């Protein structure tokens, strides 16, 4: 599907989030103002992190790896 | 909930859906870079809209007043 909606992030998260709670992620579209990750989480959680951040590149990093 | 995703219209749908497949509507939030209106259908489609064309003002004025 599209014309969905597109997902894009305008604040993000302060704290991070316990990895094991995290089942998935996406990068927000480059149409976005900023850039932004979307980690999925197991409750199914929708949640805007930084993609500058060590340990969201950590996490999609070890996510891309499994 | 938040830090959700915003939802951003970056096209729209460019035939008017029979009103009767309309379940609700949103508008997308003033963050984003163009306005929208987010349709829903009756089978949960979400159909982004231009708040500017004639049938869309009146899809929502009908949904608000009933």
Do not use: H, M
Request: hydrophobic letters at 30%; aromatic letters at 12%.
């Amino acid at each position: 599907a599209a014309d969905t909606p597109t997902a894009c992030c305008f604040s993000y998260t302060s704290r991070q989030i316990p990895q094991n709670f995290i089942a998935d992620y996406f990068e927000t579209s480059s149409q976005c103002s900023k850039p932004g990750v979307i980690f999925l989480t197991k409750r199914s959680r929708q949640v805007c992190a930084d993609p500058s951040e060590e340990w969201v590149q950590k996490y999609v990093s070890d996510l891309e790896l499994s």
